[PDB]
Design a protein around this ligand. Structure first.
Ligand SMILES: OC[C@H]1O[C@H](O[C@@H]2[C@@H](O)[C@@H](O)O[C@H](CO)[C@@H]2O)[C@H](O)[C@@H](O)[C@H]1O
Ligand SMILES: OC[C@H]1O[C@H](O[C@@H]2[C@@H](O)[C@@H](O)O[C@H](CO)[C@@H]2O)[C@H](O)[C@@H](O)[C@H]1O
Ligand SMILES: OC[C@H]1O[C@H](O[C@@H]2[C@@H](O)[C@@H](O)O[C@H](CO)[C@@H]2O)[C@H](O)[C@@H](O)[C@H]1O
Ligand SMILES: OC[C@H]1O[C@H](O[C@@H]2[C@@H](O)[C@H](O)O[C@H](CO)[C@@H]2O)[C@H](O)[C@@H](O)[C@H]1O
Ligand SMILES: OC[C@H]1O[C@H](O[C@@H]2[C@@H](O)[C@H](O)O[C@H](CO)[C@@H]2O)[C@H](O)[C@@H](O)[C@H]1O
Lengths: 721, 228, 721
């Protein structure tokens, strides 16, 4: 049985194959167990209470009880625990609180923080409600833990109520924390950089504090809101992993602290940097949702658990199991230099090769002839489009293609009518020059007038035009915070910006629910689970190099389903890397993702056109396997590997893609073994017609043969008989 | 020769076998070299200035100058550098400052922060005084770097003056910072515990942030104020 | 289905969950697969045949077939393969052979090399017989591979027949070889030293050749005839392991070679060093049996597979499931300084504490008052024993104890009547002084007169005396080889020594099958599967320190069952380490093995006596769990670990022993999780009466609490309800 149970002083939060067991000890909440299901928990792994030097106590006479040494589910500073705190509220002359458990409730079905992205499809869930109070400060903190009956994930968030007669200020308020017992641990995170997104990083947990964080106002290219605490020696196939993740797209921190006793604290939430939150009497603050996910089946186990939870409970139901259109995007194809003739000719070529959707990228609005002006001016450039957008769309529709359109609503150019009319709408500090980034500024979405304006302009665009798809961009990070009437309002504006964004995108995605919205932030600059609540695919990276895409796709699909992961076949030499790669390899690499095209089809040879038509035909066949199937990493593209290989299973279809980076000589061929087949199953390999048992493919494997050369690839396609 | 030298837009802080060479670039202070003595420094290891995506700029038209990518000796938040800041002062409705170099002085002999433990036997020392101002906020930040003639050590501290007509609040103010060029590095620290003090720890520098800290009101058994 | 199958040009050798699939390619035998079961093998992992530079060919015109690049099951030198060979026979002017497959047969039921220890209980086995011939040299090589229906092990050996009209000389003849595909591999071996036996070593496979070997004439303290080739990243719980082992107790080699293409060869057999073997026309040579064992369940998987195979098919049926007596041995207790009074008084004390068997150690024979004389003179010293051995034995029997006796049959002292009568019986070289070791010499057991003499003297000792147990010692290694009438006979004498030993011990153990024979060689100097065919327990180490015993027991039980592993509680300060350890810890450590006692019980306090009586009572209870149960390593004692923990399961009994080496301070308690329990099972912990689900014990685990101090231990005893 799954759900929530209250049994004497234990609370059991029971998801599928994952339990959190909390003990109420005289108002203090102790983490007894987080991990595989245990019923009738007795306490075999309880903390041994002893006098630990310099670890102090809530009472004078009992030296062996200390919040410095108890395992907890939230952290305070000032009561004897010196580990990093996760709740810290200023009230009167102090930022000491002492929240004590008073009452527990259980909810059933949907719930979550208002104004923030949270799980859906929650009918078969229960939520533990732990009501804590600080009687002196007259504050309440309420913790929520939600079970899921179909996934090894628990969701968490909290609400802080000010029940006092004075203003209070939240300084720290994370979404999840767990104290894990001293043991050897490794951590996996996804970091990297622009054009190197979601680089998989693994390291040993060491004494001290390790953290990843964004202070950019977006989660960022260089860190993902995820931290995987792993059993020493974890592999793809074996060992315990706990993934903590955050459904938030602004400033966040994830940290792991190893203290003086070798104990380990992990937490994730809103970054303390650039954050404070004023609460007037009777006001409350709810944190974004955190997730804790578990597998005992290594890193592939955690990928599957995380992907499944995302597909079922985050990504929009309307799209989570819907094959996504193969698109053409004109950006790398033309940049800003296009007009109607060029567009329809590209559309003609796209239709001939069987592409499904035509996306008009940057440059269609205002006087956007380059990237130095016009953001904020969402007026159609009818001169450039050679008539109305309506007439363009009709043209695209009549050629048999869906129509998509680029927006960047959060941004404003100094050189724009919007800025001329409302210069105060930009994020800025009185008496300081702007800081520029791609020669543009960020709109203050903490300003309700800004949100109202964007809802209006965009609702107008979407209702008056037959648009099938939106690409929602965001091309710089936030500087010069000073739009508040007070310092505290400025400290709130980064989170209020996010609330404004979510109000905006939840409104539009809900009001226009037939439209496929793809998120973007110079590629993967905001590829997190907050955005994926509303945008069921993401432009994974501006780097469209087939080879540079290998580690990027590795990371981008590590916790997120492949279906989310936009990938385009682009021109050579590649625009980012300056590299020639075979068209075959560009195709096979993009086909490990959500396939599209981004090159000038009108300038290709007849042969290159035929190749792309063949690629499109192939992917129409593989699309369900890739987008709806189960992903298995076989060879990981990292810093030292010269190879990449990824398998997908879906019913009677099994495919495997193999890529080799550098040509090798006098080196024995790799043996590549498949996973998760029926030993007794019979698998017919398309290329040679041979039938192999699943046992053979899994335990003997394929001798991988290639010619001489860099960046070569091949694909194996099997049908189970 | 050891001591402090000011030469066009370079400042040389020269201790025995250790130099800090700082460049004034239009009010921004750049760390050019920290390490073994170099005279007549030309800039072989200067940062190559290019357009780095999402690294923003103090002017609209120059995309290749960014405090996100320049090596510095103190860190601010809000001007395009997103690395962890080491000075952050709230004033009026903001905690954005933009301290710009205005003037350099050189002291000889003893000096240090009042009320805090500082080096003694300083007769053969010189101190570089880098006076920075935020004209809008009406704040001064003054950086001090002191040479020693008999040791490969440089000492540092700073003073922040409120020259405005309103209260201001310091939120962050570290004593030393250096941006080192991308390379492979390890770190050594002394941590441990009560009855296990100053345990020597060594690890690889990894992407992200590693820290040791005390919030105990004392430096503590489990971490020493040192990082190698 | 298991057994052997011949299907066109494939041969399938099918044990439980392990298959060897060999292809006959025009007389050459190719290793197609060794690993998990595959039926209907097609060849997905076949070698890709290409022209590899400097890899030559059996025909002029086909450059892509080369024995330098094909994966094989035996290795020759001179036909284009430059990997280390495993068969090399001199004939006429050459040591080039070219053995070609001619015919295959299948046997059922028992078979093995004559004169060498081989598996028993073989009714449900089949043996593939691969008959190879070199027509020019007129030699036959016949390879045997045997399946087992109840274990993931295949056994192998070969026979070489000289069918020519001239003498031939074998230079190399290993017992097993496999070419494994290029991949990342680690190897585990057991090495160490005297008083540090079976130290577990793990390392990466590197280009070049790694080997362990003995040239000592015994397998030796410092290397065990075992090599585990492991999947990169193997753990206790997960990953593929292939263990190759040799049932031989003389000179051996195991090697792993990584060649120029990254391919990996492994082999084990008689060491080429100190070996040559002359065959006259019509003579044949059979190699010792090698074993290849597989698990995909990590290192605990391989331990279980290896232990099970040993228990079922090597260790004597009469003893493999028989609880072994708790003994007292007087060696550390008295050394050579004893007589009848002392012996019976020790026997009295042993009986009071419930000990079962009394073993009389060195010094009872000839004029053996120290270790400088009398080896070879197996005459009872009736003066020292205060009457006949018969009268001593009766005395011991009447006190309720079984009687055991020390022998060292393979050795002779210069100062002995045996040496005075037959100086030529010693291993020696004409015209060279002896090399001495513990001031004794080795008997030439290659001399049939020596074997006849020992059979006679010992048969006499055993038939005329009511002995329940023998401790068979061997206290030096072999030097000064030169007893041959020719150089070639000398080159044969080390292997003939072993044949002589096995003839001797198979005879006596068979003719006196009620007697428990424990093997010994200054502790673990010859603790291998050759000896374990006849001697169902072994003195694991002269090091009886509780703490030094930790890594020793780790290694000694790594591939061999716990029941084999002699372990004695001894006096403090310990005689080897100069160390004080708690009597409790000495007890608990020895109780992880086959328990006995080796200290002067007559000199203990009343309290120390009561403690030992308590230990004996406890072990009488734990003995089936330890000796007959399943072993699970929980914390391994290695160079860096400060801890050791080992679990045993047997029906409704689960025990766990924990030892900490150095005292620690301000360090959080270890969390120790149990393995292989029923999640839903209820487990009652004896010490506190608490009942824990198996899920709790396995997934939460025990907080391990100890006082301050070095070398402390504790045991947890559970009963499943
Ligand atoms: O749910 C826990 C809190 O409930 C009460 O306040 C809530 C408030 O948080 C918000 O949900 O608005 C509703 C509307 O009725 C309630 O006022 C308590 O005041 C808090 O102390 C806390 O228990
Ligand atoms: O030294 C740099 C600063 O100097 C001036 O102020 C100092 C003040 O810091 C303190 O040292 O007290 C002395 C006493 O005269 C001076 O007032 C400037 O006001 C600062 O702006 C700054 O330049
Ligand atoms: O079993 C393979 C060999 O069989 C023949 O010789 C055997 C010999 O090895 C030994 O087993 O003694 C028996 C007794 O009859 C046989 O002679 C062949 O001579 C060998 O060539 C080889 O086939
Ligand atoms: O402007 C259209 C373009 O926007 C985003 O990419 C850009 C990139 O082309 C430019 O070189 O740099 C900025 C940041 O400096 C952005 O990363 C989209 O990601 C891209 O797909 C395209 O739509
Ligand atoms: O002599 C009896 C003794 O023989 C073996 O051990 C000895 C050891 O006591 C002595 O110190 O060294 C030699 C080698 O130099 C042997 O290792 C047995 O192993 C021991 O149990 C005892 O029976």
């Amino acid at each position: 049985h799954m759900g929530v149970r209250i049994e004497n002083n234990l609370f059991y939060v029971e998801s599928k194959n994952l339990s959190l067991i909390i003990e109420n000890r005289n108002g203090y909440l102790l983490l007894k167990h987080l991990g595989k299901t245990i019923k009738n928990y007795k306490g075999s792994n309880s903390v041994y209470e002893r006098d630990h030097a310099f670890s102090g106590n809530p009472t004078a006479t009992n030296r062996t009880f200390s919040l410095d040494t108890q395992r907890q589910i939230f952290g305070q500073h000032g009561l004897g625990d010196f580990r990093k705190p996760t709740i810290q509220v200023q009230h009167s002359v102090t930022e000491v609180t002492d929240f004590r458990f008073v009452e527990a409730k259980i909810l059933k079905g949907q719930n979550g923080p208002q104004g923030l992205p949270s799980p859906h499809s929650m009918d078969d869930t229960e939520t533990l409600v732990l009501m804590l109070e600080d009687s002196k400060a007259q504050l309440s903190l309420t913790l929520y833990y939600t079970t899921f009956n179909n996934d090894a994930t628990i969701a968490s968030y909290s609400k802080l109520d000010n029940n006092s007669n004075q203003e209070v200020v939240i300084h720290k308020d994370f979404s999840f924390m767990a104290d894990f017992p001293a043991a050897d641990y490794e951590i996996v995170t996804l970091q990297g950089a622009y054009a190197r997104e979601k680089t998989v990083r693994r390291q040993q947990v060491e004494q001290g504090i390790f953290s990843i964080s964004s202070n950019r106002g977006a989660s960022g290219h260089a860190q993902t809101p995820a931290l995987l605490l792993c059993e020493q020696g974890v592999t793809e196939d074996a060992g315990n992993v706990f993934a903590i993740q955050l459904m938030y797209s602004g400033n966040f921190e994830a940290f792991v602290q190893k203290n003086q006793l070798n104990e380990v604290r992990v937490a994730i939430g809103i970054n303390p940097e650039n954050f404070s939150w004023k609460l007037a009497p009777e006001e409350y603050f709810e944190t974004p949702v955190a997730l804790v996910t578990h597998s005992d089946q290594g890193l592939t186990g955690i990928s599957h658990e995380s992907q499944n939870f995302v597909l079922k409970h985050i990504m929009l139901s309307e799209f989570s199991k819907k094959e996504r259109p193969i698109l053409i995007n004109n950006w790398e194809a033309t940049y800003f230099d296009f007009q109607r003739e060029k567009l329809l000719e590209l559309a003609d070529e796209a239709k001939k090769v069987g592409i499904e959707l035509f996306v008009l990228d940057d440059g269609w609005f205002g006087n956007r002839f380059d990237d130095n002006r016009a953001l904020g001016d969402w007026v159609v450039n009818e001169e450039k489009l050679g008539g109305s957008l309506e007439s363009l769309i009709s043209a695209i529709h009549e050629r048999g293609l869906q129509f998509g359109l680029w927006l960047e609503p959060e941004m404003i150019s100094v050189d724009s009518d919007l800025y001329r009319q409302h210069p105060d709408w930009a994020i800025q500090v009185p008496g300081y020059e702007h800081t520029y980034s791609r020669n543009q500024l960020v709109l203050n979405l903490a300003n309700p007038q800004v949100v109202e304006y964007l809802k209006s302009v965009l609702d107008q665009l979407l209702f008056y035009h037959d648009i099938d798809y939106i690409k929602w961009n965001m091309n710089r990070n936030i500087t010069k915070l000073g739009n508040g009437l007070t310092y505290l309002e400025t400290q709130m504006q980064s989170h209020q910006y996010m609330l404004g964004l979510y109000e905006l995108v939840s409104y539009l995605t809900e009001k226009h629910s037939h439209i496929l919205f793809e998120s973007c932030s110079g590629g993967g600059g905001r590829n997190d689970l907050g955005m994926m609540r509303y945008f069921p695919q993401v432009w994974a990276s501006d780097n469209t190099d087939a080879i540079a895409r290998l580690p990027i796709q590795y990371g981008s699909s590590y916790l997120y389903p492949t279906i989310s992961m936009g990938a385009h076949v682009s021109a050579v030499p590649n625009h980012q890397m300056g590299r020639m790669t075979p068209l075959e390899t560009r195709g096979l690499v993009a086909m490990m993702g959500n396939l599209g095209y981004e090159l000038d089809l009108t300038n290709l040879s007849d042969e290159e056109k035929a190749t792309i038509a063949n690629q499109v035909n192939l992917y129409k066949e593989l699309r369900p396997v890739v987008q709806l199937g189960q992903q298995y990493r076989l060879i990981n593209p990292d810093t030292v590997s010269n190879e990449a290989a990824v398998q997908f299973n879906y019913g009677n279809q099994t495919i495997v893609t193999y890529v080799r980076v550098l040509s090798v000589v006098e080196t024995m061929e790799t043996t590549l073994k498949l996973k998760d087949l029926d030993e007794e199953g019979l698998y017919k390999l398309q290329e040679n017609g041979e039938v192999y048992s699943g046992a053979e493919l899994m335990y003997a494997g394929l001798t991988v043969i290639l010619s001489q050369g860099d960046f070569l690839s091949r694909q194996y396609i099997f049908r189970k008989l």
